[PDB]
Design a protein around this ligand. Sequence first.
Ligand SMILES: NC(=O)c1ccc[n+]([C@@H]2O[C@H](COP(=O)([O-])OP(=O)(O)OC[C@H]3O[C@@H](n4cnc5c(N)ncnc54)[C@H](OP(=O)(O)O)[C@@H]3O)[C@@H](O)[C@H]2O)c1
Lengths: 498, 498, 498, 498
Amino acid sequence: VINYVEKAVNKLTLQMPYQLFIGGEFVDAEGSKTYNTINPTDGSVICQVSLAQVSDVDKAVAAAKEAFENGLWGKINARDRGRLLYRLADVMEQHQEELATIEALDAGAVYTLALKTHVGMSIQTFRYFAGWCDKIQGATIPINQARPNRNLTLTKKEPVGVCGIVIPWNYPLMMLSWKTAACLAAGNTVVIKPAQVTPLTALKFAELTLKAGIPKGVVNILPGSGSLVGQRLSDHPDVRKIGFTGSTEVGKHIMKSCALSNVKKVSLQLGGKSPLIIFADCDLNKAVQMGMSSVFFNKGENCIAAGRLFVEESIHNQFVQKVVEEVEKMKIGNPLERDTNHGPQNHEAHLRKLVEYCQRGVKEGATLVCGGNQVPRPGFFFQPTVFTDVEDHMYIAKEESFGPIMIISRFADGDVDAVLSRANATEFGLASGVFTRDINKALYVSDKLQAGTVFINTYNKTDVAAPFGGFKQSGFGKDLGEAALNEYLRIKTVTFEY
Amino acid sequence: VINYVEKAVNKLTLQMPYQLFIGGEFVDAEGSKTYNTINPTDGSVICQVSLAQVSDVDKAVAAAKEAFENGLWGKINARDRGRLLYRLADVMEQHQEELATIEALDAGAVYTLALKTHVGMSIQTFRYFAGWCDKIQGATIPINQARPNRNLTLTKKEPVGVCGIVIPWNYPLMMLSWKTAACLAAGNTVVIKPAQVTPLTALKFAELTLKAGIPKGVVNILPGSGSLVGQRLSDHPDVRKIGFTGSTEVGKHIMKSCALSNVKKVSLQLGGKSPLIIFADCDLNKAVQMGMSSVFFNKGENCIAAGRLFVEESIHNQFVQKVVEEVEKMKIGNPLERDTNHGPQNHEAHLRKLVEYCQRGVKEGATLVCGGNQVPRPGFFFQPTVFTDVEDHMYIAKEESFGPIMIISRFADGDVDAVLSRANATEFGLASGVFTRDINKALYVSDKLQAGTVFINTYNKTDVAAPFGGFKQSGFGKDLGEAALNEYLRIKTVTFEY
Amino acid sequence: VINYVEKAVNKLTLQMPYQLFIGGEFVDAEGSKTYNTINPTDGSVICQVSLAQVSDVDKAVAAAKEAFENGLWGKINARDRGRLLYRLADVMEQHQEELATIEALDAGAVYTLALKTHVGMSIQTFRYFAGWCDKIQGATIPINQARPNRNLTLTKKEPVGVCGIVIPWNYPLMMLSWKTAACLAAGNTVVIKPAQVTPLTALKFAELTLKAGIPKGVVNILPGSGSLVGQRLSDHPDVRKIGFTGSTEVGKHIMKSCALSNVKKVSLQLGGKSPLIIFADCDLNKAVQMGMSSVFFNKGENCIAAGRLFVEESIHNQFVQKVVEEVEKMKIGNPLERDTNHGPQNHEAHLRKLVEYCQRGVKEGATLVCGGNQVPRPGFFFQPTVFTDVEDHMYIAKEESFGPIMIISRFADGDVDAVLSRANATEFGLASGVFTRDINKALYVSDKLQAGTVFINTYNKTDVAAPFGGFKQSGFGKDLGEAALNEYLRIKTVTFEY
Amino acid sequence: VINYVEKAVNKLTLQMPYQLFIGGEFVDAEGSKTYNTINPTDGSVICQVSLAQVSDVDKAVAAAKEAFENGLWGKINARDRGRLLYRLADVMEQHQEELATIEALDAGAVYTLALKTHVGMSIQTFRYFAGWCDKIQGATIPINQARPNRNLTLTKKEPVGVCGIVIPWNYPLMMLSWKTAACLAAGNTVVIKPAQVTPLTALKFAELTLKAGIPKGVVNILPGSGSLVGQRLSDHPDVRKIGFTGSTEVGKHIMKSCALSNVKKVSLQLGGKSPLIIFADCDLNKAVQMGMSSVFFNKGENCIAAGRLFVEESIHNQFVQKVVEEVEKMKIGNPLERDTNHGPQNHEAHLRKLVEYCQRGVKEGATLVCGGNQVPRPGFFFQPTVFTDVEDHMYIAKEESFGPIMIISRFADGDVDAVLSRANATEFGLASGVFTRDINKALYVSDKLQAGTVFINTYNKTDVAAPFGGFKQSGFGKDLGEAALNEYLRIKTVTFEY
Ligand SMILES: NC(=O)c1ccc[n+]([C@@H]2O[C@H](COP(=O)([O-])OP(=O)(O)OC[C@H]3O[C@@H](n4cnc5c(N)ncnc54)[C@H](OP(=O)(O)O)[C@@H]3O)[C@@H](O)[C@H]2O)c1
């Protein structure tokens, strides 16, 4: 019997765990400490959540270590670990309306989007990785033979062991699922730290691990602060790998802590300032649709959002006019209402950052075409924003907004290399995109863009089977695809002589 | 015209460059600073070598950046890059005696061993990776289709860009080759820092890159200190990846420096304390031969050296008697003489460390069965040493010697799990081995050993196709094999909608 | 509604379809022609089954073609084809008792075995292959560039189109499942011809595909003769691939027919005469247990059955004595009775072959230690048989029995090559095995055995992730594992210049 | 010494072996039978060549079988097999002018083209496959464990054994190289039958294998007839695999022969009627350059030649005018003149067929815009030909000419699916291309074309790393690329219990 916060909302009765999940049980933090999680649609407290302390991290890690070394998870067939993860995907899908409603409450995700992406992609992620379990394979390798003797050399793919996963607040359940699905399919056990401001879908996900029959200790979830709980995961001597998504600064600090403790493996998905180049020979009405989606999707709280749009000179004014016409049709609203297509920002501090960003944009001289302000209504809503006449030296040409602000620069007709050079002049390299009907330009621009993902005539088209990760200061290592498994496996080489 | 230090020795004329190699030219360091390199066979100065400073590191990085971004290396076909690397392997083979002779003078490597391993394995490495260049392939991925439209997703494998490689002194040419062949096969450019005490085969290799036609800037070599040159390569904003082999403490510091500068990728091959478990049912004579080799190969200055031997109770005394008989047969002496099979230690400070190490083993209670001291002859020779009665809590049971010191413990007849536990009780996890004629026990032990390489009925059997790298605090990432390439490549995902 | 033959048996009410399955529906054959299917436990008629004619085949091929070119199967995402195959496996699981009872009636499979293998391995096969759908990937390849232009080259893995699958009677549902799971996972559609004597689980399977939602025409099932229905599948100009398992002679004829019609692709899994070599140093009691299993599993009706046991001279007589003891404990009976462990032979003509085989064995001089005859009871039961003093020139040392007949030769102590030579002196090369505790012997024998599969210290250990197929006259191509997908996919190379 | 036909030509003194090559030696055929090989530039006899008989094929197969089972080729490391194949490529490069001269004389290949393609690509093929030898790798597979025991499953890639290679006359040395490089890289030995009409570069290549140190018997070459030598190779009980390139009818009879002997493996590269679709938004002058090359390259004797061009209605007439302007600039003449761009057809009977083919195209109503006839000059030159007003039911719209005959049809502006239907209405499926600047068309067209290779905005762009092979009646299996290796390897599954 679990304690729940019960809430009747969206024609459902939600049952939300709110405690730490350690060793297959929900338990209070040390000294029963708690904190409040806030609903961004009206500013209210949703409920109190356990606030993990250092001694709770140590309990979670111990539980994970025990589950890995002596529990069932380390003894079952790869195929049977697969069945458990498939079953976990079924359980999530049976609770999909509920998880999507929690995410609407906790994170501001518009409900219909949350059902299809926040939740629907997490379910795809578990199913996808469940199918890898018994298809992760090593090699047999034709090495030189120590004649007159013989040699056989093979590699075995083994789990790393206990991992810690630290994730951000923009897609709480989906980021959790990206990393956890690959981590568990590889045979590891895990301690997860959701972002403090968005713990609830993680804790409900935890309960679902019980329903799916995941052995106790395999998954542990610790709502709590980065500087305390995240830091202790990075320093812990029994943790063998950290997977991190979040900002560049915090990723530097996590990589440093992995170094100074036990050289634990790390992967990092860090910030972006992703460019989208739109040529005059593109399909203009699709460029406007996909151009808006690259900025406004998920209220701009999107790791791969296009952070600059470069638009060729001859279509630039017509492009801005069409975007303004579509912007005006967007419906801002409570994320639980069916007609809503733009929900609130995730939390108050982030809303404050966005207001300040756009003041700085106006102050340094860009043209504010629309938006820029907090919407007058309760909660933390931000008006979709369009800036034009952005120049390369401006702050908003360099800094990632993580909000629904479209930042447009022009480039001269016929220029390809000059616009590439401005798109690549950033220390980030997470994503990028190009719109053009011309196959030669599309192939040449996708070769020259210095980013982990290049979208061509589309944007935001991620897929559980297509690896996602950045270059340069956006980090290294992939989530999704077969590539994500290599972060959670190690290779043992075995060489016989006979 | 290159300046050389010329020397008649070993039936050849050595022509040794002694300057920095930057942008395809040998140059003095800033201020013409220099340092001496010392011949371990007699303590004498071989010659003066330029001493790279921070502004030389900057010069080497800029030439590597320019060779990558604009020079011919970044434009030729992958297949033509492979031709240039095969040609470099051919030029190395044409100079094989001269390379091996330099290695005997600079590092103390016995000549006949340097010919077959230091040099011979380097040549194999470049020919192996040269064959990879036009076989490195990305993927096409069956993603979900945004109906009524279609999607095509592919991955491209691309070079990471400028790399820094920092290597230890135990196999100067071979460690450089392992990392540099995989780095260059992937299409990168590189700045290499050899261990300060062993620069000379690296600078001769630099000269061979000119004879092979490798474009200027692709390879840059900076003899100099880790605390100055290595440090600046780890800090540099234009270096994108660091490959490192060396001690655990230095690899922690490098990883930390990668994090605090620009999140550069990093691979680490670090210390080891590798266990070799010898069961009573092995072929005993062969266990002696291979057990000696696991300790004494290359005067024990060998990353995968067995740091402990566990010998089953009922064969322990007979194994120790036969080892002592074979150690009496070893011929210690000048590495250029054909009968030598035990050359000097690499440099004086390391000889001192081994003298102290064996003092500590004696002090804490282990039985010194032979050796323990400097050999009374010029240069830095150390006696092949055997300790018995070693107990798990002893410093010599935990610390890596990196010298020709065989460290023997017993284990009870029919124990398997108990000896495994003792073999695994270390934060290292680089290599390991088991001798047994019993198939079940061999397979089971290899599963249970927590190390990146497990040898079965052999030892030291590395191969350019077989990935090599450690677990836990021995680091991460592979050298050799196809797996090595992944440290030097990045993956770009490209998604079209049409 | 579907017509069923209803049968109360094994505490279930079986509902068995008995018509052709074409285009999503059960229909009579042309002219309403039918034939009887025979219960091997008593010789009685289970029921009448539609007897496909040429016009039926053409219809089935037409429906498969339309389903591939225009139907839903050809349009859905690979991921959603995978979900359908996993739902199919779930539905087979919900009917596992029923399927295993049908297979007990139709093929004489002992019910407890059929539940674990015939049916339980079928379910594993569909789940394994379902996971492959969205993980089948092509390549991007670094070809030479047509400077000053660029080139991109990729490969796409596509379905081959309409396939025909012709299977034997020994594991009717499991052989169907092996091939169909890989065929459908690769995106193809299929016409399946079960062995005429065992149509019933295939027909039941057909019904299950309707329950699982597989689009109509993707799976079509035609009970009927090889010489008529199988032959027309091999000749048909719209079938693009045949997958075949059965005898070598029919395999040759199907290959020839593929060639003369439209060069359709073909895979073949043909006979075997698989040797098992048992050395004096093996675990003897285990060798008896696994040696018994290698011959008598599934009444000897087992493609991978060891057809010759070679037993080292010093343990031969004691091996034979222990085999006779275990043979005497076998309970021969009705496959529905729980204590049975040896069921009847599949059909009468096969029983006659086995009687003639053992007559020839006795005639040519082998020693008959037990069995050799039809058991005195209704049905087609065959007494488990052991022959010793088998010499390499004897018919029964060359020809595959497919029956519960253990065929034993000696080899001299210490011989390894000489027994390899005898074990390899056959035109077949399907499976093989070796029992020995010696690692060096096991690795060497497994290198020298000329067979698709080598078991070491076990036998009959097939796995749905492990590819299974023959060398020489046992055919080519694999079922099971990633390799099986290659028979059902084609590779298209796309090369752009830009 | 080897007997040569000596000929002073092209500034060289060619030395051409003319005998059978069996077991490392040039020998006369049985009864000293010989036949003439004919220079197509003037109809003269070049020399007499041995004419292999049945007993000569048996000798070559015996020598290939001994070389594989007992000789050095079966025992050396995979890496050292690769060094010998890279040494063979170097010897071919040292003789490249003499090989290209022999191909100009024997096959009519224009010398400058024979240097870069017939010869230059053969050299790239041996270098590329030489790099695969020590990178062919098997797998280790996470099967279910037979608890309380453990299982290890691995696969080994092994050579198939003795192979027969049967090749056509259009690129004598290059088709030999494509199949032989991959066959030998995988470890096999081979008997090669070159086209009877073009034996000479094959025999010169056999002599190069001696200079490269390939062990005697690993390569055997038997000039003579398909129906005698080729037939006996396909029937031979010790040949395990046939690699064939040529016409559909012969490929069907070969596959039937493999089936009726010993189920040997077979790969088949058969005819083509490859379509090239030129849209109105292409780059027109390039389309004309590439369109011309798609047909006329190597005098149309080119397995991937475009056999139909479809040109969108609004550019058709301008396309044809530009074609005729280009064809008028083609210089026809002796293949040694360095301005020749159009050499003679390969032999007399093929020229005759081209004359009949064109008479037939005029007769059925197509418009002859130029050519259609033998050029009046000694030898077998055929005039470059252009047909317009070709309709889908015509013989020349269905049958492959294999000659320099451009076959053009219009298709309607804006149709895409309709021209695709017509491009796909053939039982061939070897190659195809599309010229268009529009990315959406190029991608959609490449997905819908039913051909093993699709070129986009280029043609004839084959590459040793990019697999090449047909669909439908164009056969199956690939040459080139990693995929070619799989035709020449078998997979052994080895499964342990411990
Ligand atoms: N098993 C292994 O794979 C492995 C390999 C090598 C060594 N070891 C262990 O380490 C010991 C060797 O000691 P060591 O002091 O010679 O090795 P080390 O300090 O780890 O040196 C390795 C390389 O790192 C460089 N380096 C030092 N500080 C650096 C910094 N701050 N930034 C960048 N690079 C830096 C060194 O330069 P300098 O030339 O100035 O020192 C040297 O080239 C051995 O006794 C052995 O136990 C283990």
